[PDB]
Amino acid sequence: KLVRLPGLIDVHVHLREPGGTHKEDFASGTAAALAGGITMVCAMPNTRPPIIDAPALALAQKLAEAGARCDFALFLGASSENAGTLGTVAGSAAGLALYLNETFSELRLDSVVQWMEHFETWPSHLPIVAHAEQQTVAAVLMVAQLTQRSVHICHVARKEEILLIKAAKARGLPVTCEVAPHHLFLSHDDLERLGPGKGEVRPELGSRQDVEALWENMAVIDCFASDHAPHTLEEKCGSRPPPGFPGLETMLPLLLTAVSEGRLSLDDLLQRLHHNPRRIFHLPPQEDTYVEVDLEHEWTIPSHMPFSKAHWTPFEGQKVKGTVRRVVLRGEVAYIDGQVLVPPGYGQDVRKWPQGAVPQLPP
C-alpha cells in the first residue's frame, strides 16, 4: 500500500525568472517541483534584476502569478542601499534574505553594521534568512541577539556550522536552519565522478565527516530545502561556472530512500519538509492538497530529470527507492505519471491569502 503526505514546502529555490529564463522559468521550475512532490516554494531574490525593492517585487509577483504551477512566496533581498525602505512591502514577501557570502554585486554588504541596519529596520516579526558560511554564522547570530530577534541559517553544510547551531539552540537562542540534500548524500568522494565543472555548489560539498555530522545532528535541522539553483550544462561546463544544483526533482526521492533505511522516520520527514516551514515562515494551510508516493519502487536517478530546464543532475547514478505518484492542489489534480496537469498560472502568492498573513501584534 501507498502513503499520502501533506502538500510539502520547499523554502529555498532559485527560479531564474526574471533574467535567466533559459536556465529555468517559474513554469519550468514549478513543474520540476510538482514531479518532486512540493506544492509551495519560496523564491530567492538573486534574479536579474534582483528583488531588492517594491517595483522588482511587484514585477516578480506578476511574472509568478502568470507562470507558477504551485503556490509560492517571494523573497526580498537585502542590499547595501535598501535598509529601511522596504517597510511598505515587507509583509508581501516570504521574508528578507541576507547574502553574507559570495558577493553578488548588488546583494553584497560592506560591513556587519550594515547587517545590523537590516535587523533593526525590517519588522522584527517577519522572517530573515542568511547566506552565511563558517564563522559568518557566528557573526549573523550575534546581530540577531543584539536586535533581539530570530534568524534562519541557509544551506548548513559543515560539521562546525551545525555544531554551532546546536549550541545556540541548547542555550535557548531563537535560531532555525536548513540543510540541502546534496550536503546530505554526496561528499568529497563523489567529486571524481562530478568533476570540478559540475561539482560547483556553494557551500561546496564537504567530507563524509561533515555529512555524518549533519545526519548525527538531525534534531538540529529544522527544514530541508533544495537550493534548487539550475543552470544549463553548457554554463556549468565552461570557464566561470555558476555554483548550484538542480534538485527540486531529486530531493523527495532521496529523503524517501533514507526513510526506508531507518536513517530517519517519516514524521521526521514531514516535520522538516512541511510542518516547520509552515511554522517558521507563518505560511498557511493549502486546503484540499496532498501527495501520494510509493515507498518500494527501486530506481536509478537518470542523466537528467524530466521537467527542470537544468537538463542534468549530480545525483546521476544513485540507486534510490521512492517515487512521486500523484500531486493534487486545492481541489484539482496536478501531477500524474511523467506529466503535469496544472497550467502556467494556477499557483498564487500565499501572502495574498489571509491565513498566509504573518501574525503581528501592535506594540
Where on the chain is the footprint of Zn ion (CB under 5 A)? Answer: 227
180 within 8 A of 226, measured Cβ to Cβ: yes
The closest of 272, 293, 338, 308 to 33, measured between CA atoms, is: 308
Q: For residue 283, what is the DSSP state? A: P
Q: Which is nearer to Zn ion, 181 or 322 (CB)?
A: 181
Q: In this structure, what C-alpha cell is assigned to residue 98?
A: 541576507
Number of H helices and E strands in the chain, helices first, is 12, 13
Q: Which is nearer to Zn ion, 17 or 227 (CB)?
A: 227
Q: How far is the CB of 306 from Zn ion (least distance, A)?
A: 23
Q: How far is the CB of 338 from Zn ion (least distance, A)?
A: 28
Residue linked to cell 547587517: 115
143 within 8 A of 175, measured Cβ to Cβ: no
Residue nearest to Zn ion (CB): 227
Q: Which is nearer to Zn ion, 227 or 249 (CB)?
A: 227
Contacts of residue 259, defined as CB under 8 A and 6 or more positions apart, other chains included, come to 265, 266, 268, 269, 295, 322
Q: How far is the CB of 229 from Zn ion (least distance, A)?
A: 6
Q: In this structure, what C-alpha cell is assigned to residue 229?
A: 539553483
Q: How far is the CB of 304 from Zn ion (least distance, A)?
A: 20
Q: Which is nearer to Zn ion, 97 or 269 (CB)?
A: 97
Identity at 37, one-letter amino acid code: G
344 within 8 A of 29, measured Cβ to Cβ: no
Q: How far is the CB of 353 from Zn ion (least distance, A)?
A: 26
Would you call 178 helix, strand, or coil by DSSP?
strand
The closest of 326, 300, 323 to 313, measured between CA atoms, is: 300
295 within 8 A of 256, measured Cβ to Cβ: yes
Q: Which is nearer to Zn ion, 17 or 346 (CB)?
A: 17
Q: How far is the CB of 99 from Zn ion (least distance, A)?
A: 9
As a whole number of angstroms, the distance between CA 152 and CA 179 comes to: 11
Q: How far is the CB of 12 from Zn ion (least distance, A)?
A: 6
